[PDB]
RNA sequence: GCGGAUAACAAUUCCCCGGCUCUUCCAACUUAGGUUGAAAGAGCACAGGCUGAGACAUUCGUAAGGCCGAAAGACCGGACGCACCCUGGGAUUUCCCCAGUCCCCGGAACUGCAUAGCGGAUGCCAGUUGAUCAGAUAAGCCAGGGGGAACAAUCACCUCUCGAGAGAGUUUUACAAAA
DNA sequence: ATGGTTTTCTTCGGGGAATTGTTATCCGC
DNA sequence: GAAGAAAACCAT
């Protein structure tokens, strides 16, 4: 019911409600459909670029961010819910730290120790206890000294944030810019909540500081208590996606046309821009089979292994059973590092356009199925690639 | 302004379980060979990018000053030593950019270290061939983290008809006025 | 029946130690 | 999420 308009110069204009005029404009070539959702058209002719003030209200969250644009009278012209991938970041970073430590131990430290043992350049006692500065307890260095441990004097800029905190802050800032692309936002209101979630608390001062440099003299702050009062006074239904509506309407001095937005908000999903991991599966389990049935997982138990190993099998079975055993160790699997990534736009073999949620299956170097953001699976060989992932996607 | 408490998530180094390839030897099971296992030993460690030496061991040295001792030295201290600190320049590094780690030259203030780190000497571990460059050369560094740009087979809402086709549905992108 | 193709279903490396750091909130002097 | 094996299928 609301169409977004962009001028010929590319400057956002006010939304229209005259859908018949939009259809006529597109029919005669005076406009082009820039985006499917939200439906946006760019004018081809030249006209006045005159816009009334619009207020943007941000309900901030780690997982769900609400955004609502209202007019000076309180009419709502845009509501969006953004689902972020912030929770993924700490686990990916922890996995990366573990992989880096494994790289630096298996490929560097152990090889150096092997070379020292082979060359006779090792400790006479074989191991040494080193007490390093800043430590009260020693470390054990086997056959050679440790590589220098650097933890005494490491500095960061004032205001340093973790990759997770930076991700949340940059996501909050990026959704505002994407909204500014379609709408002429004049004022921004941010909800500030009293202390009672750690990353959000870390970024709120930074978000407020950088939201005031983007809107000089047009940045406002509201409280979660004011949202409750607004909901009680104006009767807005209790729903999270409506909270941003109560935030933007907090900036309006004389509210006359105030009503809860009717319809469903736009839903935005976040997809990672890079996947730098080459390996898919490091199959490190040496499985033993007795007549097609698995009986042991390794020669001895690995760390935190509940399943029996070959040691238990040998202890509980004869020599003729161990002598008749088959070994399966699947090779490591690797991803296609130049694959079609989630968030991409494709058209199926029947003309259906969809956003890629994931790729399932593979045969003869080809993806089997493309699963979209609605759950439907499409034959990937009869699908055509249209657009790459752009980070934030309407679905 | 400082101190304390709480939470989140960032970094360096070390140690282990397990995994892969090969050798020796023993055992079991099978058609001299083959399969599985035990023991001992050796090598190996995302796909990759950069780099030509930098890893290791022993030994010597590592300011002034204070304090203990007669005997070198112990402790404090910290610089004229070193740096994770700081200026500049780089690798990873790319469609654009960053984070993190690391390297090189230098050392005003700040910060940190002296059982460390750095340097010297001695030993040990590479590669070497094609026309000054190129090649080769590891016990060298980084590598599984984040955003953005660009890329469409982009026509939505409403009405009518049988998912498909057609359509001024009030005028301006919009307010205002007008209809 | 045999060979090729599509659909369902399964599965993915861990532990410890010597240390350090940043951001936010709150409290107190 | 993504790769790959087993099952299931459909067939000529
Ligand atoms: C948070 C929801 C944001 C949805 C808005 C999507 C922004 C797309 C902007 C397209 C405009 C491109 N162009 C060339 C006209 O500038
Ligand atoms: Mg809120
Ligand atoms: Mg490699």
A339 touches strand D (CB under 7 A): yes
Q: Tell me, in Å, how far CA of A347 is from C1' of B143?
A: 35
State both tokens at A224: 């979660």
End-to-end CA separation in angstroms for chain A: 18
The helix (run of H) or strand (run of E) holding residue A346 is strand A345-347
A291 touches strand B (CB under 7 A): no
Output phi, psi for A114, to 5 deg. -60, -45
Which residues 269-288 in chain A have a CB closer than 7 A to strand B? 270-279, 282, 284-286, 288
State both tokens at A265: 């908000």
Q: Tell me, in Å, how far CA of A238 is from C1' of C6?
A: 47
- Kindly tell me the burial class for residue A66, based on how many C-beta atoms sit within 10 Å of its own C-beta (0-12, 13-18, 19 or more): buried
CB A42 within 8 Å of CB A32: yes
- Give the closest ligand to the alpha carbon of residue A180: 1
Task: Dump strand ranges (E) for A144-300.
Answer: 187-192, 219-223, 266-270, 279-281, 287-290, 293-296
Q: Which nucleotide is nearest to A371 (CA to C1')?
A: D1
User: What's the DSSP call for residue A332?
Assistant: P
Q: Which nucleotide is nearest to A333 (CA to C1')?
A: D3
Kindly report each contact of residues A172-177 with a partner whose C-beta sits within 8 Å and lies 24 or more positions away, as own/partner.
Answer: A172/A58, A172/A60, A172/A65, A172/A203, A172/A207, A173/A207, A173/A210, A173/A211, A173/A214, A174/A391, A174/A392, A175/A65, A175/A67, A175/A80, A175/A82, A175/A268, A175/A392, A176/A56, A176/A58, A176/A67, A176/A211, A176/A214
State both tokens at A77: 């012209």
Q: Which of A2, A4, A6, A41 to mutate to test the pocket of ligand 1 (most atoms within 8 A of CB)?
A: A6
For residue A42 and ligand 1, the question of a CB distance below 6 A is answered with yes
A135 touches strand B (CB under 7 A): no
* Alpha carbon nearest to ligand 1 atom 2, residue: A179
Report whether the peptide linkage leading into residue A92 is cis, meaning its omega lies within 30 degrees of zero: no
Q: How many CB atoms lie within 10 A of CB A150?
A: 7
A91 touches strand D (CB under 7 A): no
CA–CA distance, A60 with A79 (Å, rounded to integer)? 14
Sign of CA dihedral A87, A91, A94, A96: negative
State both tokens at A3: 């169409």
Which experimental technique did the depositors report for determining this structure? cryo-EM
Output phi, psi for A53, to 5 deg. -65, 140
For residue A113, CA distances in Å to A103, A110, A220 come to 15, 5, 61
């Amino acid at each position: 019911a609301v169409v977004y308009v962009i001028s010929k110069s590319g400057k956002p204009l006010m939304p229209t409600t005259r859908c018949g005029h939009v259809r006529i404009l597109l029919k005669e070539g005076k406009a082009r459909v820039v985006e499917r959702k939200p439906f946006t058209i760019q004018l081809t002719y030249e006209s006045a670029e005159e816009t009334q003030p619009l207020v943007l209200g941000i309900d901030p969250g780690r997982t769900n961010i609400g955004m609502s644009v209202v007019t000076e009278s309180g009419e709502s012209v845009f509501n969006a819910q953004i689902e972020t991938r912030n929770k993924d970041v700490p686990k990916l970073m922890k996995d990366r730290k573990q992989y880096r430590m494994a790289h630096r131990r298996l490929k560097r430290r152990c090889k150096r120790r092997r070379r020292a043992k082979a060359a006779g350049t090792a400790f006479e006692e074989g191991e040494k206890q080193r007490l390093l500065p800043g430590c009260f307890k020693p470390i054990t260095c086997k056959s050679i000294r440790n590589k220098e441990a650097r933890f005494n004097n490491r500095k960061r800029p004032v205001g340093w944030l973790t990759p997770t905190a930076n991700h949340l802050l940059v996501t909050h800032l990026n959704v505002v810019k994407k909204v500014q692309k379609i709408l002429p936002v004049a004022k921004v209101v941010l909800e500030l909540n009293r202390f009672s979630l750690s990353v959000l608390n870390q970024i709120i001062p930074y978000l407020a500081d950088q939201l005031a440099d983007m809107f000089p003299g047009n940045f406002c702050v509201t409280s979660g208590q004011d949202t409750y009062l607004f909901r009680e006074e104006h009767g807005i239904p209790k729903d999270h996606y409506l909270d941003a509506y109560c935030i933007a309407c907090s900036a309006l001095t004389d509210a006359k046309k105030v009503s809860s937005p009717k319809g469903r908000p736009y839903m935005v999903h976040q997809f990672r821009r890079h996947d730098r991991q080459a390996c898919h599966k490091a199959n490190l389990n040496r499985s033993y089979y007795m007549g097609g049935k698995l009986v042991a997982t390794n020669r001895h138990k690995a760390m935190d292994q509940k399943t029996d190993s070959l040691e238990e099998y040998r202890a509980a079975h004869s020599a003729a059973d161990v002598s008749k055993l088959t070994v399966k160790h699947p090779s490591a699997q690797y991803k296609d590092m130049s694959r079609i990534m989630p968030g991409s736009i494709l058209v199926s073999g029947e003309g259906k356009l969809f956003t890629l949620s994931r790729s399932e299956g593979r045969n003869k170097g080809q993806v089997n199925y493309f699963v979209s953001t609605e759950g439907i699976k499409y034959w990937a060989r009869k699908c055509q690639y249209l657009r790459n992932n752009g980070g934030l996607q309407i679905y």
